[PDB]
Amino acid sequence: SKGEELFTGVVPILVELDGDVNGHKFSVSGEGEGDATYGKLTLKFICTTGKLPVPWPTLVTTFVQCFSRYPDHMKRHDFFKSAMPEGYVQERTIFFKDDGNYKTRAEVKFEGDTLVNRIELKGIDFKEDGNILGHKLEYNCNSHNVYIMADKQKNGIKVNFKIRHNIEDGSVQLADHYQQNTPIGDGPVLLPDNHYLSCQSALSKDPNEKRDHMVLLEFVTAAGIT
């Protein structure tokens, strides 16, 4: 496939986000590389505006599913790579149970040999003392499945999943994700049969980094079809 060939090797990744959560404005710049052959992503994010006003884990899902490893027999269901290099628009509403919500719009595409994820994020209705603005979430990520369905209406896909963020008191903060992706270009894309992506994310810190940041190692494999 067209885009498929663009991911056979290691690809540099750039992530740029501008956010506003309850009036707290911030920006994050991320850099790294992905190797879809192994569904592997390695990235480092820096809050360039100072301190991040929300917990880093809450932004992980927002910060390029085109790096998911699609088994050879499922290659025809890989919408993400099929939309490349022109890219796709990814939109989400993330509902934090008993708290606010993030609405995001991103464009994922190639700029030269670099895969770029440019995001605008808007958060509202958060509680000042809640788990998000109150920073009560653990610095880690649980593993989750991402459910994908074709969205013929918009020549794209509809995606849904639940993310459970660990709260420091041992509880969990649910973040219900509703997502839509549509091609930026007019080229043909692969509309998939229902399947899911099995995801795992490991968060860490760079011991030599004094700026507010997050180091992320992620592995994603598509499954659900034999």
UniProtKB/Swiss-Prot annotation:
Effect noted on mutating V189A: In mut1.5; shifts fluorescence lifetime from 3.03 to 2.72 ns
Impact upon substituting N194I: In mut2.1; shifts fluorescence lifetime from 3.03 to 2.50 ns
UniProt xrefs under Gene3D superfamilies: Green fluorescent protein
Expressing tissues: Photocytes.
Effect of substituting F63M: In RSGFP4; increases fluorescence and shifts the major exitation peak to 489-490 nm
Outcome (variant: S171G): In GFPA; leads to enhanced fluorescence at 37 degrees Celsius. In Venus; leads to yellow fluorescence, improved maturation and reduced environmental sensitivity
Result, substituting Y38N: In EBFP1.2; shifts the excitation and emission spectra to shorter wavelengths and increases quantum yields compared to BFP
Single GO BP term: bioluminescence
Documented effect of changing E218G: Suppresses the 399 nm excitation peak, leaving only the longer wavelength peak at 475 nm
Keywords: Chromophore, Luminescence, Photoprotein
Result of changing N142I: In ECFP; leads to cyan fluorescence, folds faster and more efficiently at 37 degrees Celsius and has superior solubility and brightness
Primary role: Energy-transfer acceptor. Its role is to transduce the blue chemiluminescence of the protein aequorin into green fluorescent light by energy transfer. Fluoresces in vivo upon receiving energy from the Ca(2+)-activated photoprotein aequorin.
Subunit (UniProt): Monomer.
Identification of the protein by name: Green fluorescent protein
Natural source organism: Aequorea victoria
Upper classification of the organism: Eukaryota, Metazoa, Cnidaria, Hydrozoa, Hydroidolina
